[PDB]
Symmetry: D2
Subunit: 233 residues, 4 copies
Amino acid sequence: TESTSFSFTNFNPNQNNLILQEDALVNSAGTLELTAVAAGAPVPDSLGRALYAAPIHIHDNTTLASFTTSFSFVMAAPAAAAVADGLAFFLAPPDTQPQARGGFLGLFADRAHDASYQTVAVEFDTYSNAWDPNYTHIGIDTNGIESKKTTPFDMVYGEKANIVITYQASTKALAASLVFPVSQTSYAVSARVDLRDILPEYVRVGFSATTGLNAGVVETHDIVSWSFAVSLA
Amino acid sequence: TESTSFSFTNFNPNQNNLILQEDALVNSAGTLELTAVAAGAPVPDSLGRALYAAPIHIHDNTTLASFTTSFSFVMAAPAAAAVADGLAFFLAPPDTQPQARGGFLGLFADRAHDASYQTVAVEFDTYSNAWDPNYTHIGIDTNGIESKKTTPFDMVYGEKANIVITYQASTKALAASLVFPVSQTSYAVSARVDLRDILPEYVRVGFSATTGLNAGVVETHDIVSWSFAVSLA
Amino acid sequence: TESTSFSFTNFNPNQNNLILQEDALVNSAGTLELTAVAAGAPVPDSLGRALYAAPIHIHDNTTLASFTTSFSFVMAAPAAAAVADGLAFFLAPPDTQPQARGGFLGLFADRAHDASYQTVAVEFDTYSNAWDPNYTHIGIDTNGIESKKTTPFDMVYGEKANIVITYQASTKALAASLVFPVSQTSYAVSARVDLRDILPEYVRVGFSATTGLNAGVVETHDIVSWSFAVSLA
Amino acid sequence: TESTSFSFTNFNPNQNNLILQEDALVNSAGTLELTAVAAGAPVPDSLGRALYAAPIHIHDNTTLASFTTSFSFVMAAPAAAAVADGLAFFLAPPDTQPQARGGFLGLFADRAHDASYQTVAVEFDTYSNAWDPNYTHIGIDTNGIESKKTTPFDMVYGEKANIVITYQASTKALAASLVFPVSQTSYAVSARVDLRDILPEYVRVGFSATTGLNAGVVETHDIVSWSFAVSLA
Ligand SMILES: *[C@@H]1O[C@H](CO)[C@@H](O[C@@H]2O[C@H](CO)[C@@H](O)[C@H](O)[C@H]2NC(C)=O)[C@H](O[C@@H]2O[C@@H](C)[C@@H](O)[C@@H](O)[C@@H]2O)[C@H]1NC(C)=O
Ligand SMILES: *[C@@H]1O[C@H](CO)[C@@H](O[C@@H]2O[C@H](CO)[C@@H](O)[C@H](O)[C@H]2NC(C)=O)[C@H](O[C@@H]2O[C@@H](C)[C@@H](O)[C@@H](O)[C@@H]2O)[C@H]1NC(C)=O
Ligand SMILES: *[C@@H]1O[C@H](CO)[C@@H](O[C@@H]2O[C@H](CO)[C@@H](O)[C@H](O)[C@H]2NC(C)=O)[C@H](O[C@@H]2O[C@@H](C)[C@@H](O)[C@@H](O)[C@@H]2O)[C@H]1NC(C)=O
Ligand SMILES: *[C@@H]1O[C@H](CO)[C@@H](O[C@@H]2O[C@H](CO)[C@@H](O)[C@H](O)[C@H]2NC(C)=O)[C@H](O[C@@H]2O[C@@H](C)[C@@H](O)[C@@H](O)[C@@H]2O)[C@H]1NC(C)=O
Ligand SMILES: [Ca+2]
Ligand SMILES: [Ca+2]
Ligand SMILES: [Ca+2]
Ligand SMILES: [Ca+2]
Ligand SMILES: [Mn+2]
Ligand SMILES: [Mn+2]
Ligand SMILES: [Mn+2]
Ligand SMILES: [Mn+2]
């Protein structure tokens, strides 16, 4: 048996147990800024990822782990109608490096599906690319930017969101939920996927986010709190 | 700081840490049968309730507690169309006793709202009464059977369901999600409610269920697993 | 599998999830006072016990649960020279009632060993009765006041002490350690005992304590904090 | 607030979440052989270390964290009176590297007390060096191999032992206890140490062990299970 848990109520500028890539960085306020913020306004062409230092044993060939994770984020926008591109929580191999920005969220290099990405991601996509449905949406990505499944949702800017993602091993279900606590709205999605055909035994977990490739088509991507727990029986 | 937590992966006929009211009972297969089962058939006119033996501290007048709970259930039915009445997870005063059966779920005596009930419930409602919407639903009940908010959902008889209910003290958000892992469908609702105004400091928690009042309009109400956690920081 | 856990960093005078017996009572300052305190002084002839409300599943005939519990207490004495009688942590049948005061610590009726007590206790004994070693001591009581095993220790009055008691199921070992963190001294005992032969499947756990029967041979018995976890795999 | 926890009931040869140094390796049976084992006998001159991948946040300059760790080990020896050199659990800067073998257990280079070590350790010492007492002992190393405090203890080769180390912030108490369950003997030690003055904000945790520098003066140093939890309020 094996277990890994961790939780953050706020981050520090010198979070030695977090791996920060590209522009990610932590405020002097304790908030984790995935994408760059200059004046107090989002910048375009930005990419940032944050990973937890230790790999988690997510399966051992014959048995799968269960896991639960909760986080809360905030997106601000100078113009709530021209925004991009989104954030994602993901799982991938321990040696994962940033990919292409803009629409690819730093998780892929192009629009093809490729078994070698070995990446599973849950995305909150705010810019309709050619591979997207024409509305803001949540999507489950198995090895590609073109989701396995998506559902519509309405972003509320300036409002702290609460996310919960769970994977039950006995049914091999991965479920995600999103609630806007003050606005009182919630959205949920579920798919089955056997992690043993997709991932290596050990992965790293974390966040990724990008801003649009043009001026004014832009938004913040802040992580506010984060907790995670796994169990391998 | 105060916390409570418990989990059951299955039950035992002599579960002295549960309080079983009316018909509720535990199987030879270790499954909590809230309502009565004759051969392998649900009997009508049944009422069951099961509570945790320890009262829990859900608020101290000025501060609210956070809590999360997970349970799984199964409803079975000889006839998928003649069904009633549903099951519910609830919070109430420690000395709570069963109320009326049928569409009242063993939680209320009639259909009027009344602050003296001091009860909060998330209901899984399978039969439309005069006070219901005309479709299968999940509702949040605050001191009454007439829900204060509902959303539609479609049952899947014969399939284990996963439910998660979280309460976040800082935003007073009550949120529920329900997933059919095998059929891959999920539903979510959320409301804002200040428990300090509704409940006493200490409550007991658990489930209540009822079968319909007429022969042949009936379903089982089995609880398969359950876990709970509270934090009063 | 079943789990049970709770923690208290401080108490409330109306702690509905504890069972207060005889003299036990909680201060306006949140300190559990097991034996009576008049103006700042402990009273003689005092007896008091406190238990967590929910029974816990400690064995099921074939398998033992493992458990861990931590608590801190303080003893205050007008004269460190004449003190009695001590405090004990114990497991017992859910319906357990207080027995004799004084040297029996509210756990037993007289000095005989009787398998029907179904009581196991770890005691901090501050007065040498005829059935005791001549020195202050920690003791392990199996169905009787006359300890099955003891080690000597010296009480430091006025200092908050830290106690940790663990039972490991696979080796059937019961272990206790005590540390006075500021004075920097520590004590420890262990012994092997199969609970399936002694206790019923379900038990309540808690503390018990008493003062001397003669004016002036007295001390306080204050529980300041408490946490517990059990796991039955 | 931040937390970190993990636990291993057994290990795997490809434990990517552990950092293995020098000779450290994992058996085909799931035991972490800190020091080399050739036929079925220990090897002289061996040095092994193992750390958890993620650094842990032990303080933020003003507030200290609390922590609890539990592990089990087994030492085997061909000849009970020709054994060396012992094993240790420790905290050190994230980029800690192995030091001198033999009686330094791989934590120190010589025998001075240099504050630039930034290392705290609890050793189980099996061979008397010049700086040691003339008996097997548990010692508390703060920035040097010459323990700041020790107590005697009698080893029991072949028997699995249980160690529990707890650090408490409010009192700045470090406390160790060791139990030989089947043999029913236990030992304990405690000391007061402010980790803000010794350790950096983030440290790694783990075990180190060495065999004797001379042919035949040897013993194995195996880790069977390990559990760890921290909280920085
Ligand atoms: C553990 O041992 C107990 C003592 O034998 C069991 O209780 C006994 O169970 C018999 C059923 O096989 C029953 O006819 C006996 O009259 C009963 N005796 C007593 C002292 O209660 C206990 O069995 C469980 O508890 C009882 C009350 C029933 O609900 C049974 O269905 C249970 O098996 C044993 N517990 C377990 C978990 O097996
Ligand atoms: C939260 O509010 C309750 C009602 O406003 C408090 O109970 C009341 O406490 C009064 C003194 O504060 C007491 O004289 C009243 O009789 C009592 N009213 C009721 C409904 O019992 C409660 O105080 C706690 O509980 C009571 C029973 C006392 O034992 C107090 O010592 C307790 O503090 C309030 N709870 C807290 C933690 O403030
Ligand atoms: C999970 O399956 C893996 C691939 O089939 C195992 O790795 C393979 O193990 C072989 C030895 O049995 C070895 O020769 C192969 O080169 C290796 N393949 C790869 C891609 O590394 C893996 O076994 C674990 O990992 C290897 C590296 C060794 O350390 C084994 O001792 C480990 O058990 C399987 N993991 C488990 C938990 O069985
Ligand atoms: C704990 O104390 C450390 C020593 O004073 C702090 O590091 C120092 O912070 C200064 C910022 O006010 C900075 O100029 C110094 O260069 C730095 N010293 C070193 C040795 O790096 C530390 O502050 C954190 O660490 C530095 C790198 C910054 O990133 C700060 O923003 C961090 O807060 C103190 N840690 C905390 C939690 O304050
Ligand atoms: Ca897009
Ligand atoms: Ca209805
Ligand atoms: Ca005595
Ligand atoms: Ca030595
Ligand atoms: Mn998309
Ligand atoms: Mn309804
Ligand atoms: Mn005694
Ligand atoms: Mn030494």
